[PDB]
Structure formats: structure tokens, C-alpha cells
From a paper:
The first crystal structure of OPR3 from tomato (SlOPR3) showed that the enzyme crystallized as a self-inhibitory dimer in which the L6 loop, a critical loop involved in substrate recognition and coenzyme binding, from each protomer intrudes into the active site cavity of the other protomer. Based on these observations, it was postulated that the formation of the self-inhibitory homodimer represents a mechanism for regulating OPR3 activity and, thereby, jasmonic acid biosynthesis.
The self-inhibitory dimer of variant R283D differs from that of the wild type, as only loop L6 of one protomer intrudes into the active site of the other protomer, while the other loop only covers the active site entrance of the other protomer. As a result, the active site of only one protomer is entirely blocked while that of the other protomer is still accessible to at least small molecules, as evidenced by a bound MPD molecule above FMN. The folded hairpin-like structure of L6 that only covers the active site of the other protomer is stabilized by an intramolecular salt bridge network between E291, which usually lies above the flavin cofactor of the adjacent protomer, R294, and D243. In detail, D243 electrostatically holds back R294, which in turn prevents E291 from moving toward the active site of the adjacent protomer. A comparison of the protomers in the R283D dimer shows that in protomer B, D283 forms a salt bridge with R343, like in the R283E dimer, whereas in protomer A, D283 is not involved in any interaction and thus free to move. D283 is located only 3.5 Å away from D243 and thus might push D243 toward R294 via electrostatic repulsion, indirectly supporting the salt bridge network that stabilizes the folded L6 conformation. Nevertheless, our crystallographic data show that substituting R283 for an oppositely charged residue generally affects L6 conformation and thus the dimerization process.
Numbering used by the authors:
A (entry chain B): 10 to 296, 302 to 384
B (entry chain A): 10 to 384
Write the structure that this text describes.
């Protein structure tokens, strides 16, 4: 099983290639990591395994979900430390994902009810609804287009949050630049309609993710920085006319950051849509090797994500399409997913109803082990 | 095994509940049924089993795949007859699926290179491809929105083809009203942007499928007509803002057609969604497998008659669906491609041949068509 052959991720020696994908679960009451998060990550931690945390706030304006953790206050860093300590006691490596939702927020989630910030003034369309603090779903409001001068202020929030993460004991950080959130709102030409130096051409649209990665790379070192992109995922109206060229342009910038710093990033993390069920239709399979194309052009560690199974993950590693395989949904309901992939044992099903609830046990830590 | 308890599908008494799902295979060279189809359907026919044919053209404008069979010419009728006879010789029941692709076509498939017809002028998005006659995967073009008289012309094509089907010996026909093809392009508010009496509200959007079903029911009788739909589907941009209400509106129409005709349709056939949610919140999308099951059972409980489910089913999922009352029959597609004796394999709980997607749509009369081995 090539999923359990050791792999050196920069300076971290991993014993296997099964990775916990970042997953918002909304158990961090009041934006403060709670003891429940420790038991949740401790359950899934393994000796020499790689874990990525749920998206974590970098500032008071970056949230678009209820009760998601932040890492922009020393109070939050102190709570994260207790969680990271428990995870390191099991021998796992843990990165914290730095998450800013941009226009994918609501006044109820913003201080003083301010409008969310984004690259554009265009709101997410009515085809998408935001989970509200009362369990209902509401409308995405019109965001405020941040001025050219303000982009460096947001970059500074990433930089400070990476430093707070190191202060909490995290091994590294992952930049959340996928799924139509703030960074993807600058990448995709279906959203970025800016006239300034951050909009228009492909090179300009990659300016934002570049300065963000450069800022955290300089602060804590490249080998502690991972980057997650989703060029071909249309979530929250975040479509690009040419996902291939966008992906390659990002890879080009990432290779350049590594060449300038003289160090390789922790990894590149690319996620794709799950077309598992398109085989039962007449035309679902007619006609995109983007994953392999980006893997071929990138210099360093590649984590593939999106609809991967035990058999698909094995094939991906044995084929060389990726070095590590991250699992989301399966990890929600299978705390010992690593061992289950080892033994090829049956997997538990997940319950969508408790993805985003606040119970510290129900649907969170009560999925059974083998 | 509840799958092998008999079932009375109207006037047809079936011996088991394993159904051959309709599957385009592209072996009907020049749109004429070929001897290969006879051997293909013969291999899968069982005594008292139900078969549904590949989607079959109702008119020269109805195709969006290469070498798909027609049933709108008398030559096609004569060739189908030979195939139905071999199936009937094995004691099987066989329906012919009537299929119009509408905007899911290309100029290379249309008479005189004309534009495909549809409810709208909007083309299928760049996320989808069409199979071209040379095996390449191409881009769907802009269709032509058709008017009221032309719509009635299409209904007449369905009606004439229904009559040809029974003249060829078929036990009945299935209306293909799923997967974003012509009927679904009228049903789904994600496709139908019309402002006339065929677009807008749910009532207007269900007008076309209602007229098609009524025409064929009046022509050959209700108990020889089945209807297939897919209210929650990504295929070919066939999204709807409220798949549940759309599905119930259709069921209401079918129930009323049955009451007015004093007879019941052969069945309602509903396909599972071709997608699985990932925690997202998109209008018109089912958020979980549990909501998916509730959708299907709600349509089943609403329809006055036989219910066939399809889409990713296995032996275990098919037993459960029948045991739990979720469906009366279960149709299998890909597993039937690679397992000509799938019925016996389900019965014996035997291993199943893998299928080769390569050869689903090639034109070879044997390779990947009739060369899958028996037990
Ligand atoms: C409930 C839930 C929460 C998620 N939260 C995040 C997140 O905070 N950050 C992120 O980058 N991806 C997030 N994801 C996406 C996962 O990483 C996703 O499941 C993965 O990209 C696809 O892998 P899978 O097929 O194994 O589920 C989330 C997914 C789910 C279902
Ligand atoms: C190759 C192929 C061709 C198909 N052709 C048709 C068709 O012509 N008409 C139709 O209504 N469905 C068609 N379908 C959908 C199937 O009838 C059925 O809904 C699907 O195969 C069920 O899923 P399963 O293969 O997992 O059993 C086709 C499916 C496949 C895979």
C-alpha cells in the first residue's frame, strides 16, 4: 500500500500519506477554540500523520460561519496551544488553515454590522445562501470593494495570524485560497472586475495570493507554509473562463517564491469537484486533466483532494499524481480513517445535519472507532 | 429475495423486479436497428423480465448521439420487429424508449445542418460535451426556440412513434422526460426561460410533458406507456429551483391523466441525482443522501401506480428499495452492460463483470457489446 510509505514533507517526517483535510465544524464557541476541538483532532491524530485544521479567522472581519475559531488574539492562541499540545502528544503534525471569507459573509458576522470586504462590489447571487446563527439560511449582502491601499492591511492580518499560529505551537499554516472566498475572489475573472493593479490580466489577478504567500513565507519560513487552490471549483459564483491558465499562473508564482526565498513551500494543495455520480448519465463522462497538469509544473509536494477514496488515493500516489491525499467527509465519520484505510475496513457514513452544529459530542466526537 | 417476487405491471405479469435500464449504445448504424441489437437484448432477456430499449428517435431532429435507432420510419419498424421477436421468444417484456434530445444535439445530426430545436435559445454550457460522429467530444451549439404549432408537431411525432412501436411488437413505450433532454428543457426553470404559455410558472412548464403523455396514452392505451423523469439532476444544466415541487406537479398530471382515461400507466420511472452534496448551500440542490431518499419516496407515495427507481443501484440497494417499499422495480444500467445474465447473478449473489466505459458508445457489433461473458 503506497499510502503507508514514509514521506518527507520538507522538515516533517510523515509515516503515511493520508491527510486530514480542513473542515469547518462550528464547535469553536464564540470564535474561541474549545476543549471539544482537542478531542476531535486527538481522535484523528496518528503518529507521523498530517492534520489540517478547520479554517481559522485572521481578523474580526474574516468570518462567514457561526462559532468558527480565530487566531488573531492572544486569547485564541492560548486556547489553540492546549489543542496543539494534545495533538503533538499523539505524534501528529498539524497545520492551521488561515481563512478569510471575503464577500461570503453577512452583517450578523461582521463587527458593527459592516459590509463584508471583497475584491469587487458584486454580491454572491441568490443561487447561494449563507447559514445564519439561528440555523436558517439568508442572503449574501453587497460587499465593499477594498481600495488598493487596503490590500496590504489584509496581507498583514495573514502575517500576524501565521506568527500567532507558530506562537501556539502549530507546525505550520495553510493559506485558504479556494472555494470562492477572499483570495479566490481575486483570482477568478468571473469575480475580479477591478481596474487597478489587482484586476484585469491574469498576472494582476494573481497579485493578491502572491503577496499573501510571500508575506507568510518571510514571517515563518517557506517549509511551514502550504497553499490550497481550487481553480476548477465553481462555489459561490467563483468561476474562471480558463481554469487551466489560472492554475498554471498560480503554480508559476509559487515556484518563483520558492526560487527567491531559496526554500520549498510545505506543499501545494489542490482540491477538485466530486463527479463520482456522473457515470450514470448519458453525457456525464464525455470530455480535464488539470490536477496532473498542475502537478507536473509545480516543484515540491503536491496534495490532491476532492472525492478521493482508498482505491483512488492509492492509485493517485502509486501513479505519481500526488504525494499526499487529503480526505474530508470520510474523516468526519471515521475518526480512525487512517487505520481503516490500512486494513481496508468498512467506513462509517456521515450525517450532513451535524456538520455545522454546536454540539461538542453529537455528530462531532461520537462517530465510532473500529 | 424480494427482488424475485412476482409483480403485476398492469397487464404484464413480471417474474422478478430486475429491469434493464434504457442505455444508448450507438450500434444502430444509420439509425436502423441492426442484428447486433437483437443478440444484445436477447442475451439480457429473461422469462418474465422487463427490458427497456436504448433511447429511440421519434423524428429526424431527435438525435444527439451517433447511430442511435429510430422508430419513425417503416423500415425501422420492420427491423425492430425482428429484435422484439427474439426478445419475446425468451418470454421477456420490452418497452421502447422514445427519445428527443432537443438542444442537446449538433448541426451534424440535424437535417440540412439546421439548428437543434428546444424550448429556449440558450445553449448548454461549456461544462458539457456532445459525442460527435467521429468519436470526438464537441461543444453544443445554440438551439432554436420553437413555437406552439411546432410543439404540437413534436407531440405528433411522439404519437406516431408510439404507434410504430406497437406495430413492431413492442409491449409498450417509455417517454424519456429526464436528463435535460427535450421534455426536461421545458420542465426545468433552469432551462425554460419562455414567457408564453409553456414557460414561467410550474403549471406552464408541465404543459409539454402533459401533452406528450396524453397523446401517446390516447394512441396506444395507458397501460402501455411509462414515463421517466429526473427532477434533481445536474446533467446538461437541467437544474430546477424546487425539484420536489416540480416532481409533485408532474405526478399530479400523470394521476389526472390516469383518472381521466380510466386506466393506469405502465409505471413512473425516476432517476437518482447524478451528484452528492459536500456541505454546500445551492438553491435547487439536495443537501444530503437522506434528503435524496425523502425526495424519491415522496414522489413514489404521491403517484398512483408502479414506481421504478434507477441510478447507481446494486444488489443490496435494490433489495432494500423493494423491501422497504421505496420502489416496485429497480432498473440497472452499467451492471447490465457488462453482465448479460445480471438477473441470475443477482439471484445467485454471484460476482459481477466490470464494465469498460471505452466501449459504451463505439459502433462495434461485438466488442464491448455482446462479448461480456456469462456465468
Ligand atoms: C463540513 C465541511 C467543512 C469544510 N470546511 C473547509 C474549510 O474550512 N476549509 C477548506 O479549505 N475546505 C473545507 N471543506 C472542504 C473539504 O476540504 C473537502 O471535503 C475536500 O476538499 C473534498 O474532499 P472529500 O471528497 O474527501 O470530502 C469542508 C468540507 C465540508 C464537508
Ligand atoms: C452508457 C449509458 C447510456 C445511457 N442511455 C440512456 C438513455 O438512452 N435513456 C435514458 O433514459 N437513460 C440512459 N442512461 C441512464 C441509465 O438508463 C440509468 O438511469 C443509469 O445507468 C442507472 O445507473 P447505473 O448504471 O448505476 O445502474 C444511460 C446510462 C449509461 C451509463
Amino acid at each position: 500500500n503506497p499510502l503507508f510509505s514514509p514521506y518527507k514533507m520538507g522538515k516533517f517526517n510523515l509515516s503515511h500519506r493520508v491527510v486530514l483535510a480542513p473542515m469547518t465544524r462550528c464547535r469553536a464557541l464564540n470564535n474561541i477554540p474549545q476543549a471539544a476541538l482537542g478531542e476531535y483532532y486527538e481522535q484523528r491524530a496518528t503518529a507521523g500523520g498530517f492534520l489540517i485544521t478547520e479554517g481559522t479567522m485572521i481578523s474580526p472581519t474574516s468570518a462567514g460561519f457561526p462559532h468558527v475559531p480565530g487566531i488573531f488574539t492572544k486569547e485564541q492562541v492560548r486556547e489553540w496551544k492546549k489543542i496543539v499540545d494534545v495533538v503533538h502528544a499523539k505524534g501528529a503534525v498539524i497545520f492551521c488553515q488561515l481563512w478569510h471569507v471575503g464577500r461570503a459573509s453577512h452583517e450578523v458576522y461582521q463587527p458593527a454590522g459592516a459590509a463584508p470586504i471583497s475584491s469587487t462590489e458584486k454580491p454572491i447571487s441568490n443561487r447561494w445562501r449563507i447559514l445564519m446563527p439561528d440555523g436558517t439560511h439568508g442572503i449574501y449582502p453587497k460587499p465593499r470593494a477594498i481600495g488598493t491601499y487596503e490590500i496590504s492591511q489584509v496581507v498583514e492580518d495573514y502575517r500576524r495570524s501565521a506568527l500567532n499560529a507558530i506562537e501556539a505551537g502549530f507546525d505550520g499554516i495553510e493559506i485558504h485560497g479556494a472555494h470562492g472566498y477572499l483570495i479566490d475572489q481575486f483570482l477568478k475573472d468571473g469575480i475580479n472586475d477591478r481596474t487597478d493593479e489587482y484586476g484585469g490580466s491574469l498576472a494582476n489577478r494573481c497579485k493578491f495570493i502572491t503577496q499573501v504567500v510571500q508575506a507568510v513565507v518571510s514571517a515563518i519560513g517557506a517549509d511551514r507554509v502550504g497553499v490550497r487552490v481550487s481553480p476548477a471549483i465553481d462555489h459561490l459564483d467563483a468561476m474562471d473562463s480558463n481554469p487551466l491558465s489560472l492554475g498554471l499562473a498560480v503554480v508559476e508564482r509559487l515556484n518563483k517564491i520558492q526560487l527567491h526565498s531559496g526554500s520549498k513551500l510545505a506543499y501545494l494543495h489542490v482540491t477538485q469537484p466530486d463527479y463520482v455520480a456522473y457515470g450514470q448519465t448519458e453525457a456525464g463522462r464525455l470530455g480535464a486533466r488539470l490536477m496532473r497538469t498542475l502537478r507536473n509544473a509545480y516543484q515540491g509536494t503536491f496534495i490532491c483532494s476532492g472525492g478521493y477514496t482508498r482505491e483512488l488515493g492509492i492509485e493517485a500516489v502509486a501513479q505519481g499524481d500526488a504525494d499526499l491525499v487529503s480526505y474530508g467527509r470520510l474523516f468526519i465519520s471515521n475518526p480512525d480513517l487512517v487505520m481503516r484505510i490500512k486494513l481496508n475496513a468498512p467506513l462509517n457514513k456521515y450525517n450532513r445535519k451535524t456538520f455545522y452544529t454546536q454540539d461538542p459530542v453529537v455528530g462531532y466526537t461520537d462517530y465510532p472507532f473500529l
